From Swiss-Prot, chain A:
The gene is SAS10. Residues 1-18 have a biased composition (Basic residues). The lineage of its organism: Eukaryota, Fungi, Dikarya, Ascomycota, Saccharomycotina. Interacts with snoRNA U3. Interacts with MPP10. Component of the ribosomal small subunit (SSU) processome composed of at least 40 protein subunits and snoRNA U3. It comes from Saccharomyces cerevisiae (strain ATCC 204508 / S288c). The chain holds residues 561 to 609 of 610 of the full protein. This is Something about silencing protein 10. It is found in: Nucleus, Nucleolus. Primarily required at the G2/M phase. Essential for viability: involved in nucleolar processing of pre-18S ribosomal RNA as part of the ribosomal small subunit (SSU) processome. Belongs to the SAS10 family.
Swiss-Prot record, chain B:
It catalyses: L-glutaminyl-[histone H2A] + S-adenosyl-L-methionine = N(5)-methyl-L-glutaminyl-[histone H2A] + S-adenosyl-L-homocysteine + H(+); a ribonucleotide in rRNA + S-adenosyl-L-methionine = a 2'-O-methylribonucleotide in rRNA + S-adenosyl-L-homocysteine + H(+). Methylated by HMT1, forming asymmetric dimethylarginines (DMA) within a domain referred to as an RGG box, made up of repeated Gly-Gly dipeptides interspersed with Arg and aromatic residues. This is rRNA 2'-O-methyltransferase fibrillarin. Keywords: Isopeptide bond, Methylation, Methyltransferase, Nucleus, Ribonucleoprotein, Ribosome biogenesis, RNA-binding, rRNA processing, S-adenosyl-L-methionine, Transferase, Ubl conjugation. The chain holds residues 79 to 326 of 327 of the full protein. Belongs to the methyltransferase superfamily. Fibrillarin family. The modification Asymmetric dimethylarginine is found at R3. The keyword Metal-binding does not apply. One of its GO terms (molecular function) is RNA binding.
From Swiss-Prot, chain F:
This is rRNA-processing protein FCF1. GO terms for cellular component: nucleolus; nucleoplasm; small-subunit processome. It comes from Saccharomyces cerevisiae (strain ATCC 204508 / S288c) (Baker's yeast). Essential protein involved in pre-rRNA processing and 40S ribosomal subunit assembly. Required for the early cleavage steps of 35S rRNA at the A(0), A(1), and A(2) sites. The gene is FCF1. Interacts with FAF1. GO terms for molecular function: RNA endonuclease activity. Residues 48-147 form the PINc domain. Disulfide bonds: none annotated. It is found in: Nucleus, Nucleolus. The lineage of its organism: Eukaryota, Fungi, Dikarya, Ascomycota, Saccharomycotina. PANTHER family: RRNA-PROCESSING PROTEIN UTP23 HOMOLOG. Belongs to the UTP23/FCF1 family. FCF1 subfamily. GO terms for biological process: endonucleolytic cleavage in 5'-ETS of tricistronic rRNA transcript (SSU-rRNA, 5.8S rRNA, LSU-rRNA); endonucleolytic cleavage in ITS1 to separate SSU-rRNA from 5.8S rRNA and LSU-rRNA from tricistronic rRNA transcript (SSU-rRNA, 5.8S rRNA, LSU-rRNA); endonucleolytic cleavage to generate mature 5'-end of SSU-rRNA from (SSU-rRNA, 5.8S rRNA, LSU-rRNA); maturation of SSU-rRNA. Keywords: Nucleus, Ribosome biogenesis, rRNA processing. SUPFAM superfamilies: PIN domain-like.
Swiss-Prot record, chain I:
It is found in: Cytoplasm; Nucleus, Nucleolus. This is Ribosome biogenesis protein BMS1. It comes from the Eukaryota. Residues 58-71, 78-95 have a biased composition (Basic and acidic residues). GTPase required for synthesis of 40S ribosomal subunits and for processing the 35S pre-rRNA at sites A0, A1, and A2. Controls access of pre-ribosomal RNA intermediates to RCL1 during ribosome biogenesis by binding of RCL1 in a GTP-dependent manner and, via its affinity to U3 snoRNA, delivering it to pre-ribosomes. GTP-binding and/or GTP hydrolysis may induce conformational rearrangements within the BMS1-RCL1 complex allowing the interaction of RCL1 with its RNA substrate. Required for RCL1 import into the nucleus. Residues 58-99 are annotated as: Disordered. Interacts directly with RCL1 and the U3 snoRNA to form a stable subcomplex. Component of the 90S small subunit processome also known as 90S pre-ribosome that consists of the 35S pre-rRNA, early-associating ribosomal proteins most of which are part of the small ribosomal subunit, the U3 snoRNA and associated proteins.
Length: 49, 241, 111, 59, 94, 173, 181, 91, 99
């Protein structure tokens, strides 16, 4: 049981990254740019009504 | 990644005064007000324009919280070319210099700092940038520098203080134009480490509403920062309803 | 011809309606033509409404309201064989009379 | 079709029998061909190919 | 899968063309036949439409483009590969 | 040269800009709150902040359940109850019949939240607040409002049932 | 007129200089546009004919349902209108009320039928060819674009023999025979 | 300028299709129509097309990957059809 | 591919006439004139059509993945809809049983 719950949690950690951005320690080394690209026309802010 | 001899394509962002450098990786870049030098060691890009050698600077999201806001997808920034911006908590030119680039020659930047040791470099940086006015004064007492500042289109506050809501309150009333912009960077730990971050953000927004500032949007700065959010609002003196 | 002429209340514009159906609205002082209609029809009289922008023409059987440029806006089906047209400026009423022996008042603002 | 039967007499016994291909196309034994012995004519619901194999199910 | 053994859900393998018939090619199965029948019906469907369009054609139809387009002696429409050079243009190119 | 197919110039209702119907005529995907681990709100922790709905006060009085003490009993933690202007306005509009409910709602231990919107409809005000910030418990017995809050992930939902309050989506219990 | 401010619009709710109730929504202008009608009063002459049909159908409907007179006359009206082409179908009597419209009559004018027969790319183009004497119905040339074509007479709409359009059709397919022309 | 240098044209064409350049990057799904205004520049501290073909790991990857796509594209095509008709002939 | 008979193709209406371009045989002068940059440009011109081949294939495979999962998902969605449909009927019989 312990091993199955171990693999279940680490699987959920991977899925959480695809659901939202997660802090992962910040910058490591020289800044190498946005690796997956910048989207000019997309906004993710939560807008107050 | 973004090595020396690499070649990139520079295109404009949705926000005026901000650009994107395409390639194997994308970079947020702003046109260099003072070509040929770096404020804090950021990478720079030169373009041969008919010829004059124009230069661009890289904006690192992990160093500037405003840059992190652009990456996360803020909808509206009141910081734009030809506008006066009152920058509170300007520790040094890490983020003010990039703001000075956006406003351009026609705009001005009123950089307010309290500590003298960061202040000294802010003076030295300001002399490369004619459009930056350094004000080495405490932001908790705007009356001290009322002579120095006129009306400003936007107010940007990065002060990491428990009473930043009052600091933003007083400065906006004196200098911010009606229907002007307000941009706040809130770090939960400085304000109240006892409670969770969500409680702190809800509390700061309520204070801004009390101060006739209508919040427009909120964004958290992950993965660049933890327990941070940028709140973008408008100063509606007439009424928020 | 023959030509029936009506000036605007302020005297800046001239409206001429030929009997065989040539209607022209112009600023006679500047010699500029606002509209010119060649309605192949018998036209009796025309009038300006509250200003030079709109004018009315009494054609063979119906009265039509036209625009500043000459685009037809309405066909007044209720006004039948009107031979005289008048406009009361302060009341915004168009008045017609003709062979039917009927006097009709029409509100241009509300229609 | 060829090789199903050895003489035209055998075909006559099975005229009208249901046949099908490996593809599943259904057909019928219509008539025996006079030349050569054992060959016969069939009609299928759709065109068959040379690589197909026709099978008659019997018990 | 309720009340079914995995033995029941066993794969049944697919048989192949006989060696004596290996020259003719691959032994088609039902899935292969479906590909033929569907393709044939798709083509026959359009052809029936095209034959009908031909039958109901009005000889008096006129289009302004009839001036630009040209037809071959066979009666088929001619389409230019890319869509002459003046002597001045040729002289420069030469 | 006179053109062919001449027609009288007339008003084109579909295309004329002057007519009112013709005068009138960046994507946003909200981020998922970092306080949520899938359906589990990790951020929320005591002391809790609870938004009181109008019907909650009325049912609490019917069952003789004190708001502050009843919440502490349900969650076993310090609760900071909050009443918005909409809820306070709704209580005042109920009339003289609910004067008792109005006086309890004004207890000093119940803190007040201001509102900066025109409407007096409280159901919408509460739903907008929870969508913005995942730091509130919603205390309500309205069937319509409860179903809205259930669809929103990471919003604990409190109700008065039987003899005391009940909290649904709060794993720390 | 300029856009009215708030207090003005409240006091001038019914003011409309371009749309009146007596216009009936500018239905006449819309229909004249769709079928390119050049005489301003052609719509209202059609409208009076439609009203006559609708008046008769209403009077017939008020006769008792099993009346032989009612059934006979309604069928005759359905027969005549379908033959003219005004009505697409003969099955239902309610079509005499619901489906009898000016648009139905305008849809039988010579330019529109030329368009549906693909003799012209647009109704405006068909009107020009009629006005330029390219079109004949039967052996008779017609330059009136208001000519109403019945179902039977739609078979005899064709080009004039020496028309330049006819030569272009035959030249395009390389089927021009100069003996005919 | 409308001249649109072949180098400049290829680099923009190599940014539009940057997802295929490396099987380990997997960028965000965007379209990136060519902008009206742009400026190519270099980084201060060899065009990208020339830079990329200079590497050997990438060149060996494209040749392999390209060849595999050719095998898929020419399977069952006219080349296969002629073989089938040729077996039916005796030799 | 489908081959329309020429007899049908001949008597087709102007709107629907198939454009079939014939092959070129006589060598055109422009075809004899065009210069193709060889050597370095050949390698930079094979490289591009290799890259665009990978990109077109990667898109056509990921796009087929969505269409495979689209079919699976709508089958799952339909089952949930049927449950919500039948159970909804039961509630409306229990409600009107009171009424
Ligand atoms: Zn409220």
């Amino acid at each position: 049981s312990r091993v199955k719950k171990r693999k279940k949690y680490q699987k959920a950690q991977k899925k959480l990254k695809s659901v939202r951005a997660v802090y992962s320690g910040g910058q490591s080394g020289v800044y190498e740019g946005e690796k997956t690209g910048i989207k000019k026309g997309l906004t993710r802010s939560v807008k107050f009504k | 990644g973004a090595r020396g001899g690499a070649k990139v394509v520079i295109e404009p962002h949705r926000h005026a005064g901000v650009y994107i450098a395409r390639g194997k990786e994308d970079l947020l870049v702003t046109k260099n007000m003072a070509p040929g030098e770096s404020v804090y060691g950021e990478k720079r890009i030169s373009v041969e324009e008919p010829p004059t050698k124009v230069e661009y600077r890289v904006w690192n999201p992990f160093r500037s919280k405003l840059a992190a806001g652009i990456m996360g997808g803020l909808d509206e920034l009141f910081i734009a070319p030809g506008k006066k911006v009152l920058y509170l908590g300007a520790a040094s030119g890490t983020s003010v210099s990039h703001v000075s680039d956006v406003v351009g020659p026609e705009g001005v930047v009123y950089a307010v700092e309290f500590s003298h040791r960061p202040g000294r470099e802010l003076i030295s940086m300001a002399k490369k940038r004619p459009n930056i006015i350094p004000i080495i004064e405490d932001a908790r007492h705007p009356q001290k520098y009322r002579m120095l500042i006129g009306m400003v289109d936007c107010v940007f506050a990065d002060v990491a203080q428990p009473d930043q809501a009052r600091i933003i309150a007083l400065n906006s009333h004196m200098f911010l134009k009606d229907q002007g912009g307000v941009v706040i960077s809130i770090k939960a730990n400085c304000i109240d480490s006892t409670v969770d971050a969500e409680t702190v953000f809800a509390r700061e927004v309520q204070k801004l509403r009390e101060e006739r500032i209508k919040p427009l949007e909120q964004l958290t700065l992950e993965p660049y920062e933890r327990d941070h959010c940028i709140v973008v609002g408008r100063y509606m003196r007439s009424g928020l309803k | 011809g023959p030509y029936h002429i009506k000036y605007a209340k302020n005297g800046t514009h001239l409206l001429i309606t030929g009997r065989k159906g040539h209607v022209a609205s112009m600023d006679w002082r500047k010699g500029q033509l606002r509209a010119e209609l060649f309605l192949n029809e018998t036209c009796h009289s025309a009038t300006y409404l509250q200003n030079e922008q709109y004018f009315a023409v009494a054609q063979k059987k119906y009265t039509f309201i036209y625009d500043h440029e000459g685009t037809e806006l309405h066909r007044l089906k209720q006004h039948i064989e009107a031979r005289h047209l008048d406009f009361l400026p302060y009341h915004y009423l168009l008045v017609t009379a003709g062979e039917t022996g009927w006097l009709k008042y029409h509100d241009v603002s509300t229609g | 079709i060829k090789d199903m039967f050895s003489s035209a007499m055998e075909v006559a016994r099975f005229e009208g029998a249901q046949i099908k291909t490996v593809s599943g196309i259904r057909g019928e034994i219509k008539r025996a061909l006079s030349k050569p012995e054992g060959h016969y004519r069939a009609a299928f619901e759709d065109k068959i190919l040379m690589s197909d194999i026709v099978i008659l199910r019997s018990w | 899968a309720k009340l079914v053994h995995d033995v029941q859900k066993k794969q049944h393998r697919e048989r192949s063309q006989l060696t004596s018939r290996s020259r003719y090619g691959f032994l088609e199965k039902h899935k292969d036949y479906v590909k033929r029948a569907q393709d044939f019906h798709r083509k026959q469907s359009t052809l029936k439409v095209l034959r009908e369009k031909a039958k109901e054609r009005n000889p008096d139809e006129y289009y302004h483009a009839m001036h630009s387009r040209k037809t071959d002696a066979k009666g088929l429409l001619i389409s230019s590969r890319h869509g002459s050079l003046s002597m001045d243009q040729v002289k420069l190119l030469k | 040269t006179r053109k062919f197919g001449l027609v009288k110039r007339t008003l084109n209702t579909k295309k004329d800009q002057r007519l009112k119907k013709n005068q009138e005529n960046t994507r946003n995907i909200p981020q998922v709150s970092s306080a949520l681990f899938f359906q589990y709100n990790q951020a929320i922790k005591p002391p809790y902040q609870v938004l009181i709905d109008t019907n909650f006060i009325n049912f609490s009085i019917q069952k003789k359940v004190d708001i502050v003490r009843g919440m502490m009993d349900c969650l076993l933690a310090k609760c900071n109850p909050l009443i918005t202007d909409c809820v306070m306005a709704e209580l005042e509009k109920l009339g003289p019949k609910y004067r008792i409910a109005l006086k309890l709602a004004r207890d000093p231990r119940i803190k007040r939240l201001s509102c900066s919107h025109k409407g007096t409809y409280a159901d919408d005000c509460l739903v907008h607040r929870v969508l913005q910030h995942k730091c509130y418990i919603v205390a309500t017995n309205d069937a319509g409002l409860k179903q809205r809050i259930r669809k929103i992930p990471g919003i604990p939902l409190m109700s008065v049932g039987g003899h005391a309050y009940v909290i649904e989506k709060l794993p720390d219990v | 007129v300029r856009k009215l401010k708030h207090h003005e619009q409240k006091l001038l709710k019914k003011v409309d200089f371009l749309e009146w109730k007596q216009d009936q929504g500018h239905r006449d202008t819309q229909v004249m546009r769709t079928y390119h009608i050049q005489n301003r009063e052609d719509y209202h002459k059609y409208n009076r004919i439609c009203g006559d049909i609708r008046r008769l159908a209403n009077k017939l409907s008020l006769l008792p349902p099993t009346d032989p007179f009612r059934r006979k006359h309604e069928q005759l009206l359905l027969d005549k209108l379908y033959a003219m082409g005004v009505l697409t179908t003969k099955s239902k009597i309610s079509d005499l009320e619901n489906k009898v419209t000016v648009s139905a009559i305008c849809r039988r004018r010579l330019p529109v039928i030329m368009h549906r027969l693909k003799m012209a790319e647009t109704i405006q183009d068909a009107v020009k060819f009629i006005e330029q004497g390219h079109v004949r119905v039967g052996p008779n040339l017609i330059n009136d674009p208001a000519y109403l074509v019945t179902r039977n007479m739609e078979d005899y709409v064709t080009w004039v023999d020496n028309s330049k359009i006819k030569k272009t059709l035959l030249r395009y397919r390389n089927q021009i025979d100069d003996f005919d022309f | 300028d409308d001249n649109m240098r072949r180098e400049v044209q290829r680099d923009l064409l190599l940014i539009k299709h940057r997802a295929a350049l490396d099987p380990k990057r997997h960028y965000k799904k965007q379209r990136w129509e060519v902008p009206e205004r742009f400026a190519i520049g270099t980084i201060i501290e060899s065009t990208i097309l020339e830079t990329l073909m200079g590497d050997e790991a990438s060149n060996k990857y494209f040749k392999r990957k390209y060849n595999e796509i050719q095998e898929k594209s020419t399977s069952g095509r006219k080349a296969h059809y002629k073989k089938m008709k040729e077996m039916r002939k005796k030799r | 591919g489908l081959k329309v008979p020429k007899a049908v193709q001949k008597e087709l209406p102007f709107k629907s006439q198939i454009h079939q371009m014939k092959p070129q045989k006589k060598k055109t002068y422009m075809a004899k004139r065009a210069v193709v940059l060889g050597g370095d440009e050949k390698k930079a011109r094979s490289f591009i059509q290799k890259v665009l081949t990978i990109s077109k294939a990667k898109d056509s495979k990921r796009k087929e993945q969505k269409a495979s999962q689209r079919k699976e998902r709508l089958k799952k969605l339909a089952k949930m809809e049927e449950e919500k449909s039948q159970r909804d009927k039961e509630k409306k019989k229990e409600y009107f049983a009171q009424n």
